[PDB]
Write an enzyme that holds these catalytic residues in place. Structure first.
Site, PDB file in Angstrom:
ATOM      1  CG  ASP A 196      -1.923  -1.015   1.142  1.00 22.05           C
ATOM      2  OD1 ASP A 196      -1.462  -2.337   1.770  1.00 22.05           O
ATOM      3  OD2 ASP A 196      -3.038  -1.040   0.908  1.00 22.05           O
ATOM      4  CB  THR A 246      -5.194  -3.727   2.075  1.00 19.98           C
ATOM      5  OG1 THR A 246      -4.967  -2.872   1.157  1.00 19.98           O
ATOM      6  CG2 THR A 246      -3.892  -4.054   2.912  1.00 19.98           C
ATOM      7  CB  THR A 277     -17.991  -6.278   2.402  1.00 24.34           C
ATOM      8  OG1 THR A 277     -16.992  -6.546   3.038  1.00 24.34           O
ATOM      9  CG2 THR A 277     -19.364  -6.782   3.247  1.00 24.34           C
TER      10      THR A 277
HETATM   11  N1  AMP Z   1     -15.519  -1.060   7.670  1.00 28.61           N
HETATM   12  C1  AMP Z   1     -14.350  -0.774   6.997  1.00 28.61           C
HETATM   13  N2  AMP Z   1     -13.318  -0.215   7.324  1.00 28.61           N
HETATM   14  C2  AMP Z   1     -12.460  -0.002   6.416  1.00 28.61           C
HETATM   15  N3  AMP Z   1     -12.471  -0.256   5.179  1.00 28.61           N
HETATM   16  C3  AMP Z   1     -13.537  -0.602   4.548  1.00 28.61           C
HETATM   17  C4  AMP Z   1     -14.861  -0.869   5.427  1.00 28.61           C
HETATM   18  N4  AMP Z   1     -15.754  -1.219   4.451  1.00 28.61           N
HETATM   19  C5  AMP Z   1     -15.152  -1.121   3.258  1.00 28.61           C
HETATM   20  N5  AMP Z   1     -14.106  -0.623   3.238  1.00 28.61           N
HETATM   21  C6  AMP Z   1     -13.421  -0.510   2.306  1.00 28.61           C
HETATM   22  O1  AMP Z   1     -13.902  -0.426   0.999  1.00 28.61           O
HETATM   23  C7  AMP Z   1     -13.498  -1.426  -0.060  1.00 28.61           C
HETATM   24  C8  AMP Z   1     -14.544  -2.312  -0.137  1.00 28.61           C
HETATM   25  O2  AMP Z   1     -14.760  -3.016   0.970  1.00 28.61           O
HETATM   26  P1  AMP Z   1     -14.875  -4.824   0.736  1.00 28.61           P
HETATM   27  O3  AMP Z   1     -15.776  -4.986  -0.111  1.00 28.61           O
HETATM   28  O4  AMP Z   1     -14.803  -4.908   2.286  1.00 28.61           O
HETATM   29  O5  AMP Z   1     -13.497  -5.478   0.494  1.00 28.61           O
HETATM   30  C9  AMP Z   1     -12.155  -1.773   0.693  1.00 28.61           C
HETATM   31  O6  AMP Z   1     -11.140  -0.696   0.550  1.00 28.61           O
HETATM   32  C10 AMP Z   1     -12.220  -1.766   2.204  1.00 28.61           C
HETATM   33  O7  AMP Z   1     -11.357  -1.951   2.895  1.00 28.61           O
HETATM   34 MG    MG Z   2      -6.334   0.624  -0.324  1.00 32.22          MG
END
Ligand code: AMP
Ligand code: MG
Ligand code: MG
Ligand code: MG
Length: 303
Positions: free
Chosen positions: A46, A117, A190
């Site tokens: 990152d 990540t 997610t």
């Molecule tokens: N509660 C959370 N905290 C930190 N990053 C999030 C959160 N929800 C979603 N993201 C970020 O949004 C993007 C899509 O989320 P995901 O579908 O969970 O991978 C990724 O960058 C995640 O790290």
């Molecule tokens: Mg990122």
């Protein structure tokens, strides 16, 4: 034009970022830092990818506004991280006339140097993307997505990694567009940031299948390649850099990305980074999904 030279440069820069992402894994020390919690991570990839992307863009376009996910103290940047190339094949494409006069000081670049990540740390490598989105007048107009581990499990004859790009008015490039089989509702969401509101919103779509994968970039690629019919994330958490480049690619093939209320997202320089009303995205049949978001869930989120 400025815009197309930017896009051509962003393509080569994203590829360099993808190389950095793969090098970090190849070398075996991820340098994981927890940010707000154990599911909110920052690795050496990152940090190095963001330094590479932002430094390489600022060198070539010194008055551009660049906004990256990671809050990195201002240091010496390792000059080996600079990418000077630009892919001449993109500069062969005519800039749409509406964009042909734009000045670099009027563009905003939204950068997610490594999206997915958490999954990267867990070995789900093909979830990872590098996102470089370009916005003008608050609208996302061009985008590059590198997927550095595309084809990771495809065997030894396959090309590892790919880069997708698009410019509204020229379309999008680097993938084979496909639709989900008719009448099938396949919802992607997610894997690591789920909660009751997220799963209740999914359930309301009457899914035939629910995919749990990491990354905003990855889930938009699932829409465009016919692996999912809707991306449904009824939660704050994702930010403008998660959605800027992916929305360009989706829009370029006739899809729609909004918040769960049905509002378009905005990308002006001074817009709040949080997508506080979540994300609803489809390639086709948007209204099926949008019309099923429960009012209680809408009321639970605001802008
Ligand atoms: N509660 C959370 N905290 C930190 N990053 C999030 C959160 N929800 C979603 N993201 C970020 O949004 C993007 C899509 O989320 P995901 O579908 O969970 O991978 C990724 O960058 C995640 O790290
Ligand atoms: Mg990122
Ligand atoms: Mg993050
Ligand atoms: Mg992200």
């Amino acid at each position: 034009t400025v815009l197309m030279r930017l896009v051509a440069s962003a393509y080569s820069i994203a590829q360099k970022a993808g190389m950095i992402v793969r090098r970090v894994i190849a070398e075996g020390d991820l340098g994981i830092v927890e940010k707000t919690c154990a599911t909110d991570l920052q690795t050496k990839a990152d940090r190095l990818a963001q330094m590479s992307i932002c430094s390489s863009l600022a060198r070539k376009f010194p008055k551009l506004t660049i906004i990256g996910e990671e809050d990195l103290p201002s240091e010496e940047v390792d000059q080996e991280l600079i990418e000077d190339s630009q892919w001449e094949e993109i500069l062969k494409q005519p800039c749409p006339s509406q964009y042909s006069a734009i000045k670099e000081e009027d563009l905003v670049v939204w950068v997610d140097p490594l999206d997915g990540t958490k999954e990267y740390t867990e070995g789900l490598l093909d979830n990872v993307t590098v996102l470089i989105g370009i916005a003008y007048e608050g609208k996302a107009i061009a985008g590059v997505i590198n997927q550095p581990y595309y084809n990771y499990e495809a065997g030894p004859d396959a090309v590892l990694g790919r880069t997708i790009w698009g410019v509204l008015g020229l379309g999008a490039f680097g993938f084979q567009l496909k639709e989900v089989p008719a009448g099938k509702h396949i919802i992607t969401t997610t894997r690591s940031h789920s909660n009751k509101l997220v799963t209740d919103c999914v359930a309301a779509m009457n899914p035939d299948a629910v995919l749990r994968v990491g990354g905003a970039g990855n889930k938009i690629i699932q829409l465009i390649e016919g692996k999912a019919s809707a991306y449904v994330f009824a939660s704050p958490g994702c930010k403008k850099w998660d959605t800027c480049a992916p929305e360009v690619i989706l829009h370029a093939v006739g899809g729609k990305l909004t918040d769960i209320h049905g509002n378009v997202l905005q990308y002006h320089k001074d817009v709040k980074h949080m997508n506080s009303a979540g994300v609803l995205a489809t390639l086709r049949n948007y209204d099926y999904y949008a019309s099923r978001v429960p009012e209680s869930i809408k009321n639970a989120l605001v802008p």
